[PDB]
């Protein structure tokens, strides 16, 4: 079964500030927080004024129920990165995450002080914290 | 409250610089691309809003954008703007996550306004634009200046993990003072109501907080007691400020490295004497008058024969009570502060005798008889002179008897009623001003170091540039002061950057400097200046405002900085100040400049038997008219001394902003705020910091930040860190003009740094999806967390809803 | 204090009162219990209170700290531009998603009874229900 509508709905209003419409930039964040990635051409074909019901229908169709965070780490393939390297990549790609948010991530996904972060463990921890 | 003048001038400050990149390679609009625009019915209908947020619509052409407004909420209607009316947007950026405006990717005007607005609305009113600090009046107690917050800002280990604050400025100034044995000045400026007085008072309280004790507590107490006293005698309720400082204040302080004021000095200049005689409707005179009449006990009333606040010619009877001001409680505090300044009980009685005498002199009526005192007021005149310890007969003679020099003989005549009223008023203003200056002089003899200041903390609190449509002599003096301080500001910015370049072997040829010495000359130069021809016309036997204007117009044809006015060219002229052209009206310039008590009345006062009154004009020279008798001549002397002192210190600038003219918290008036950003050189400070090689990080920081530009070059054990950076920059695509290698730091132009960022992002294209999903998932979690904080409150709303449902 | 006792006697079976009726009694009495109070009183005495314990519960439901400044905390959080207003849909979504969530008709009915226009002064909405 595994119905996701109550979580899809709460996330929408979290990114839309409780309005039934969400701006396009905020919509990209919303869908990304469920592992959903669109191409540029798919992005172009979206409505310009995305409302709750559109998202609830889009999420049902695009969300990966078996592997929510497949784009962090794909189980259907045959992964690790040094911490300061991983942080550097976040900063290079200009992340909205403050210095504290990064620290919660790092102790969540990596409890020890290993010099190196398992991307499969990140997708594991984030699937739990949905 | 937004006038059309403000909308007009605000619109001239607006400039389009960077261009919008709304289209991709293929020519299609980026889905959801947001811009700022100044074209919107919202703006037509609400003069508080200068810019709105839109998204460019799919199908837009390059020559003409089609947008839909999204913030504030609109209709969903598409409309067309020319690209020169579109500014870039800092979408997806937390304004509370860093404190300098310069760290935004786009620093255009609507971006700057929005960054400060959203900080202002979350009660973070301090933002830096290095080296300037920006402070927006919240018009309420934020609660972030308590003793607990002083201790927190003083005692936190690393100064940089606290948000910007006035305490951060105090802490840095005192740290540099004790770190390198260098004097500092903290210059607080801005317009009436911008919070200058509170900033100054908060910084003094920081300075007065010591880790463990101040054995010089006696002197710090006298210095902290100067605030109530200086406000009672120098502050007044105006239309726009219930507590406006009507004098310029400069202080020098000696402060232990762990807090605690050990010595001080106080300087007050350009007191608004005219306020002693008349006030506009809904304005008061200086607080002390109302504090004294309302607060004096019955014995004090008996003593000086005091009447009610409404019963005095010098005090506006319709405006004697101010909402939210307890003049009686303020008198109790002023009396305690005077005692804390080590004035005796009899010093204090003399001080209030003189105030009572000034007020009583204002009640004396003159008549045309020649002039004479009304017989009904012969006793009132006598009591007023006894209260000021002056000779009533001799004071009378100087007010009613005139001595002219005709040919070369003295001739005794009579002042008429008007001229005799001018004399009486001048005595009231002069006694009040010298009493105010005497209190400061007395305080200084208790708090100053005997040998003068070796190393000191200076503190200046002044109006910034003031621009009305009709600007008088008072605005000219203010605006001359702020030209000197502008030179201080661009001098320090240039000296600091030039030293950094020279310390790293970078060339300083491409450094920029916008000197304002030419406008300082046209205003101040000894031979050929406005202030010179003002002085000349004042000493001239038949000088006039119009003649003064004429001498300027014919002798200053040698710089742009003086521009003869268009309409009513006589009695009007324009100066090309650093912030733009300002129009002045020469009416009463000579009157105002000569408003200094001179002549025999001064010698009568110096022959008072009372030693305090002897000291009011002590040392002052007898008076033809001399330049020591002109406000403008004496002020340029003061101002030059003051600036020579400040110029020898490391300066700190706090620029105070008034966000609306209603004294309302959380109300944002974009046109007024934009006009102040321009006047306080905040926009200039952003430009200045981006010029030349504005990015400077050390080899190890440059390598950590730009590692993935050329990961092979950066992860090479064979080459040193200096050469690694060279290899990165040589292979990255940057032109050699966009970077220089220093002794220890990589120097990048702003443009080169943004290209280097975009080149590194292209190398990390395969992390885009992964980093987007990690970021977003945590963003969701932080949003729910922010919601979880408030659920206890929401449970109360839901509980009271279910209650109301039962009641139905 | 008299009304307390009549309301108890209307709903009391066998001298004890259920928590649901005790919460209805408390709203009838002008008080605003939440599930937090109802959980605290379950931990102590279960789902049926004696008149003594029923009184203790009414005591718990007082909440003196209740004022406009406190109730508006969640609405202000979503008022990004500090206009003091939120739309009806915004407040309906808040009221029906987190906390002791109302049903959708319950939220709608409460906002429609306060105002007929879409944008609601949430400071005045919270004041109005506080009586
Ligand atoms: C005739 O000359 C004047 C000029 C100004 C004043 C008053 N301004 C004094 C002042 C108060 N705050 N800051 C200042 C100054 C800043 C820089 C120079 S003065 C009150 C207007 C009075 C007489």
TrEMBL record, chain A:
Cited InterPro entries = EF-hand-dom_pair
Q: Which SUPFAM superfamilies match?
A: EF-hand
Highest taxon above the source species? Eukaryota
Q: What is the name of this protein?
A: Myosin essential light chain ELC
Taxonomic classification, please? Eukaryota, Sar, Alveolata, Apicomplexa, Aconoidasida
TrEMBL record, chain C:
Indicate yes or no for the key word Repeat: yes
Q: What are the record's GO terms for cellular component?
A: glideosome; inner membrane pellicle complex; myosin II complex
GO terms assigned for molecular function: calcium ion binding
* Keywords, in A-Z order: Acetylation, Metal-binding, Repeat
* Residue stretches making up the EF-hand domain: 66-101
Tell me if Ribosomal protein is a UniProt keyword of this record: no
Q: What is this protein called?
A: Calmodulin
What is the protein's species of origin? Plasmodium falciparum (isolate 3D7)
Q: Describe which stretch of the whole protein the shown chain covers, with first residue, last residue and complete length.
A: 74 to 204 of 204
